[PDB]
Amino acid sequence: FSRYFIEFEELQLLGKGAFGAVIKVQNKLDGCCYAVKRIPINPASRQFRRIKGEVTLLSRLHHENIVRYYNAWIERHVHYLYIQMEYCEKSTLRDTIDQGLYRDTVRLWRLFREILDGLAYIHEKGMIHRNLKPVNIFLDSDDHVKIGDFGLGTALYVSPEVQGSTYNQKVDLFSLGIIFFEMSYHPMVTASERIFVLNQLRDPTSPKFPEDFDDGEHAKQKSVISWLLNHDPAKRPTATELLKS
Numbered sequence: 001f002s003r004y005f006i007e008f009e010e011l012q013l014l015g016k017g018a019f020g021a022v023i024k025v026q027n028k029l030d031g032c033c034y035a036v037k038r039i040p041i042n043p044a045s046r047q048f049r050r051i052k053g054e055v056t057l058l059s060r061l062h063h064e065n066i067v068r069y070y071n072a073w074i075e076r077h078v079h080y081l082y083i084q085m086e087y088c089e090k091s092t093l094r095d096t097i098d099q100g101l102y103r104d105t106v107r108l109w110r111l112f113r114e115i116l117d118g119l120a121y122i123h124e125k126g127m128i129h130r131n132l133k134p135v136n137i138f139l140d141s142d143d144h145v146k147i148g149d150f151g152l153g154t155a156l157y158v159s160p161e162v163q164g165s166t167y168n169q170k171v172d173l174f175s176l177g178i179i180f181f182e183m184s185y186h187p188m189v190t191a192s193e194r195i196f197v198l199n200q201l202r203d204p205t206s207p208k209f210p211e212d213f214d215d216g217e218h219a220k221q222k223s224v225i226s227w228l229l230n231h232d233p234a235k236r237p238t239a240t241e242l243l244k245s
């Protein structure tokens with residue numbers, strides 16, 4: 001009957017929205033764990049035309065810093081789209097940030113370079129992420145970055161050139177500037193602290209780097225964050241430009 005229920009054993013709900021869910025499953029035949037995203041779809045609609053288009057791009061990605069795709073299929077039970085991805089054992093970049101990544105200088109710079117390699121690859125293949133945030137970046141068991149989706153305010157990652165009249169591959173690099181700051185800064189457990197500190201970074205005049213973010217031990221980071229967070233997209237580097245720096 002259901003391909004999902006026949007082939008997989010549900011282990012844990014990783015994510016829940018009113019309009020979608022991510023489940024950790026184990027495939028019965030190969031004994032592997034996967035993350036299976038389930039999304040309700042309308043096949044006689046433009047929403048499904050758009051979803052199928054995204055599934056087409058995703059199925060063509062092949063890089064060590066991109067969450068490995070396995071399958072996608074539809075079940076008529078109401079139509080559901082299932083996307084079977086790799087299961088990343090060490091959860092998301094949000095979890096790393098909140099557990100004090102900033103103190104770990106060698107790891108911090110390795111993870112930023114891995115997000116960069118993933119990003120450069122996606123741009124070289126003419127694609128844009130459009131939702132780059134730490135919850136959408138996963139870490140595997142060997143502590144490697146895998147860029148993913150985790151999609152079920154958060155507009156603090158959205159580039160300024162996303163308005164009526166003002167957006168290419170440089171949208172991802174603005175979001176990257178917010179992420180690298182969060183990665184290079186101490187955890188901001190409280191919402192009010194997060195919305196304040198990060199809105200001060202998106203200021204058109206200058207990205208306000210907090211008082212406890214000094215040019216003593218954060219000079220190399222401050223340069224990269226200020227360059228990526230530049231209001232004028234053309235003034236931002238490319239991912240390869242930041243890699244060959």
Ligand SMILES: C[C@H](NC(=O)[C@@H]1CCCCN1)c1ccc(Nc2ncc3cc(-c4ccncc4)ccc3n2)cc1
Binds near residue numbers: 037090094
């Ligand atoms: C239960 C735990 N939860 C946490 O750690 C929470 C997370 C939120 C913040 C608080 N901490 C948790 C959650 C996920 C994973 N691993 C994992 N791996 C790969 C994934 C791939 C997709 C994907 C990619 C592309 N297209 C579609 C789906 C979605 C989710 C994935 N999740 C491991 C542990």
